[PDB]
Every structure is written in C-alpha cells, then in structure tokens.
C-alpha cells in the first residue's frame with residue numbers, strides 16, 4: 145500500500161499519483177489548504193455536507 | 197425505502213422529489229448545484245408535466261424549508277433504452293436557482309478514477325427517498341435513508357434475470373429486508389468519505405423490493421461524470 149492506496153495519500157478528497165507522488169485536490173466549491181491536503185469550503189452550503 | 201431510518205434534520209439535504217400535477221412524488225433526484233438536478237432517464241416517462249421539490253422531509257406538514265422549482269430543460273441521455281434501462285440518467289436544469297439552506301444543499305460530484313477506487317470500494321453507500329416502505333405498500337410520507345452495501349459485481353450478475361451493463365452497479369442485501377423501492381427511482385445513492393457525501397449512483401431498478409437473492413440496481417454515475425459536466429455547461 146503506497147501513495148493514494150495508503151490512507152488516501154492523506155488527502156481530504158481526491159488523490160492522484162503523479163511522478164511517483166501524491167497530489168490532492170478537491171470538489172468544486174472547495175479550495176486546497178496550504179498543507180496541500182485538506183479541502184476548505186469557499187462559501188456557505190458547500191457540496192456534500194449535511195446541514196447542521 | 198424498505199427498512200432504514202427517517203432522514204433526520206439536515207441529514208439528506210441533496211434529496212429532490214419529482215412531483216406531478218397532483219403534487220404527488222413519483223421519483224427522486226439529487227441536487228447537484230443551484231440549477232441542476234440529477235435523476236433517472238426512465239422517470240421522465242412517468243408524468244406529462246412535473247416540478248422539483250427540495251427541502252422536504254414530511255409531505256404532511258410544512259417544515260418551512262420546502263421549495264418547488266419549475267424545470268426549464270430536460271437533458272436525457274440519448275443512448276437511454278427502455279428495454280434494459282441502460283444509460284438510465286438525465287439532468288434537469290431549473291428555471292430559478294435553488295437557495296441553499298437547512299435541508300437544501302448539493303451532493304458533491306467526485307472524479308471518476310478516485311471514486312471507482314476509493315468510494316466504490318467502501319463497505320456501503322446511502323440511498324434515500326419517499327418511496328414505498330414495502331413492495332406492495334403506499335409511498336412514504338417521510339423521507340427515509342438506508343445504508344446499502346456495495347455488492348460484488350459477479351454475484352449481482354449471477355443474481356439477476358436482466359442484463360447488468362457497464363453503466364450499472366448493484367447494492368443492497370441478499371436476504372435482509374432493506375432496499376430502495378418504487379417511488380425512490382431517480383433518487384440519490386451517495387457515499388460518505390471523511391464526512392463529505394459524494395454522488396455515486398442513481399436509484400434505477402430492481403426485481404421487486406427487498407426480495408431474497410435480488411439486489412438494487414443503480415446507474416453508475418462514475419461512467420457519466422464527463423456527460424454530467426457537459427450537460428451542466430449548457
């Protein structure tokens with residue numbers, strides 16, 4: 145188990161393997177955090193979150 | 197939905213209900229964005245004129261969050277076939293945008309490769325709807341949800357009297373009395389990953405509801421991500 149097969153490469157959402165390393169990305173309406181792993185909602189009611 | 201639990205406050209905010217002229221639900225849908233609803237192509241033949249209701253959990257009381265939306269454009273997959281339900285997918289563009297709020301929010305569209313390797317390999321997904329609570333029953337007046345295991349593809353094909361195409365997947369139980377049912381068609385199949393819910397299927401068909409040795413058959417949304425993207429750009 146390596147890269148994306150190892151705990152989703154530590155990504156919050158999408159994980160891709162490029163030049164033998166993990167690249168994380170996010171769904172529309174989220175921005176990749178500074179750590180290049182977490183996904184941050186850009187505004188209210190982001191997709192895929194239960195409302196309260 | 198047979199078995200499962202009621203959707204509690206805020207838990208299934210991406211649920212849409214296609215309602216006919218008589219204000220009765222006949223199919224479900226999934227909110228993809230302020231203007232678009234995902235549903236099954238076969239649902240389009242079950243009513244001459246329909247609207248889309250969002251933010252509703254109990255069809256017998258006004259919760260305060262409900263909103264009805266007229267459809268401006270129906271985008272039905274051109275390869276849909278009534279004989280097998282292959283390509284059972286449609287996107288609806290609404291005349292006015294959905295205002296998100298408590299009980300009204302979109303589900304996320306995932307990327308294909310990651311969804312197939314990571315989401316569809318999870319133990320379960322969640323199906324939801326206002327459909328029948330038993331094969332012979334009446335539609336539910338309460339929105340329900342059900343956790344459904346992904347089912348081995350070979351096992352599903354072995355179990356089915358009708359072809360399972362590359363555009364379909366199976367979910368549910370061999371004998372446990374839990375499944376989607378009539379009236380749930382077109383509704384969401386979502387998979388949770390780190391507390392974010394992604395669209396993974398569309399309730400499509402089944403040989404009855406919760407039958408022994410039969411599963412629920414869903415449209416494989418990951419096979420249609422580019423098609424959805426295109427339909428939402430025009």
Ligand SMILES: C[C@@H](C(=O)N1CCOCC1)N1CC[C@H](NS(=O)(=O)CCc2ccc(Cl)s2)C1=O
Nearest residue numbers: 279280281358376377378400401402404412413
């Ligand atoms: C076998 C299938 C059917 O007639 N097909 C499917 C294959 O293509 C031809 C039409 N069929 C016959 C009766 C049944 N209608 S239904 O009970 O309303 C569904 C309910 C569902 C159960 C699980 C899911 Cl997912 S949804 C249904 O979907």
Ligand SMILES: [Ca+2]
Nearest residue numbers: 254257258259
């Ligand atoms: Ca209501």
Ligand SMILES: [Mg+2]
Nearest residue numbers: 369370407410
């Ligand atoms: Mg069964």
